[PDB]
Amino acid sequence: MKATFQVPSITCNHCVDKIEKFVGEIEGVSFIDVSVEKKSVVVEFDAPATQDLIKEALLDAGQEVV
């Protein structure tokens, strides 16, 4: 139960705080991992979540991920 994405619009802390505030708890988030120098993002989600939940939240939060 883990996910691995990448936010091409990284390179900042304000974005991490915004995505962490939303992703910090998406009714099924184990741990939101982010990589600025690598421009990657690894998030763990439990059974009450889905990569469509972290996207709907992270995307609606103001972040982009392909």
Short mmCIF file of N, CA and C in Angstrom, two decimals, residues 18-49:
data_model
loop_
_atom_site.label_atom_id
_atom_site.label_comp_id
_atom_site.label_asym_id
_atom_site.label_seq_id
_atom_site.Cartn_x
_atom_site.Cartn_y
_atom_site.Cartn_z
N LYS A 18 1.77 23.15 1.83
CA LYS A 18 0.40 23.14 1.32
C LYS A 18 -0.04 21.73 0.98
N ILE A 19 0.86 20.97 0.37
CA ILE A 19 0.57 19.59 -0.01
C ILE A 19 0.58 18.69 1.22
N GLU A 20 1.42 19.04 2.20
CA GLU A 20 1.51 18.26 3.42
C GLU A 20 0.31 18.53 4.32
N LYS A 21 -0.23 19.74 4.23
CA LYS A 21 -1.39 20.10 5.02
C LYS A 21 -2.62 19.36 4.53
N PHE A 22 -2.67 19.12 3.22
CA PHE A 22 -3.78 18.40 2.61
C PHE A 22 -3.50 16.90 2.59
N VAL A 23 -2.33 16.54 2.06
CA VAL A 23 -1.94 15.14 1.98
C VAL A 23 -1.62 14.58 3.36
N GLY A 24 -1.27 15.47 4.29
CA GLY A 24 -0.95 15.04 5.64
C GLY A 24 -2.00 14.10 6.20
N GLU A 25 -3.22 14.20 5.68
CA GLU A 25 -4.31 13.35 6.12
C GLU A 25 -5.42 13.31 5.07
N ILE A 26 -5.39 12.27 4.25
CA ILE A 26 -6.39 12.09 3.20
C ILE A 26 -7.20 10.83 3.46
N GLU A 27 -7.66 10.69 4.70
CA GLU A 27 -8.45 9.54 5.10
C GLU A 27 -7.79 8.24 4.64
N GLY A 28 -6.46 8.20 4.70
CA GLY A 28 -5.74 7.01 4.29
C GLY A 28 -4.32 7.31 3.84
N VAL A 29 -3.64 8.19 4.56
CA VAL A 29 -2.26 8.55 4.23
C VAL A 29 -1.30 8.07 5.32
N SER A 30 -0.39 7.19 4.93
CA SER A 30 0.60 6.65 5.86
C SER A 30 1.75 7.63 6.06
N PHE A 31 2.29 8.16 4.96
CA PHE A 31 3.40 9.11 5.05
C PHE A 31 3.67 9.76 3.69
N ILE A 32 3.62 11.08 3.66
CA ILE A 32 3.86 11.82 2.43
C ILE A 32 5.33 12.20 2.29
N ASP A 33 6.04 11.49 1.43
CA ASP A 33 7.45 11.75 1.20
C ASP A 33 7.64 12.62 -0.04
N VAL A 34 8.54 13.60 0.06
CA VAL A 34 8.80 14.50 -1.06
C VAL A 34 10.30 14.70 -1.27
N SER A 35 10.69 14.91 -2.52
CA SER A 35 12.09 15.12 -2.86
C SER A 35 12.25 16.34 -3.77
N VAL A 36 12.84 17.40 -3.23
CA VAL A 36 13.05 18.63 -3.99
C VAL A 36 14.22 18.49 -4.95
N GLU A 37 15.38 18.10 -4.42
CA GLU A 37 16.58 17.93 -5.23
C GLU A 37 16.35 16.89 -6.32
N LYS A 38 15.48 15.92 -6.04
CA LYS A 38 15.17 14.87 -7.00
C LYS A 38 13.86 15.15 -7.73
N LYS A 39 13.05 16.05 -7.17
CA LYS A 39 11.77 16.40 -7.78
C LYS A 39 10.86 15.18 -7.85
N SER A 40 10.77 14.44 -6.74
CA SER A 40 9.94 13.25 -6.67
C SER A 40 9.05 13.29 -5.43
N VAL A 41 8.06 12.41 -5.39
CA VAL A 41 7.16 12.35 -4.25
C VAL A 41 6.67 10.92 -4.02
N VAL A 42 6.92 10.40 -2.82
CA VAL A 42 6.49 9.06 -2.48
C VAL A 42 5.55 9.11 -1.30
N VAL A 43 4.32 8.68 -1.51
CA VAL A 43 3.33 8.70 -0.44
C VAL A 43 2.72 7.33 -0.21
N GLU A 44 2.54 7.00 1.06
CA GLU A 44 1.94 5.74 1.44
C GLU A 44 0.49 5.98 1.80
N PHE A 45 -0.40 5.15 1.30
CA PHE A 45 -1.81 5.30 1.61
C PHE A 45 -2.42 3.97 2.02
N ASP A 46 -3.21 4.03 3.08
CA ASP A 46 -3.86 2.84 3.62
C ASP A 46 -5.08 2.44 2.78
N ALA A 47 -5.86 1.50 3.30
CA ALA A 47 -7.04 1.01 2.60
C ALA A 47 -8.13 2.06 2.40
N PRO A 48 -8.23 3.09 3.26
CA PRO A 48 -9.26 4.11 3.11
C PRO A 48 -8.84 5.26 2.21
N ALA A 49 -7.78 5.05 1.43
CA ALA A 49 -7.29 6.08 0.51
C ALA A 49 -7.13 5.53 -0.89
#
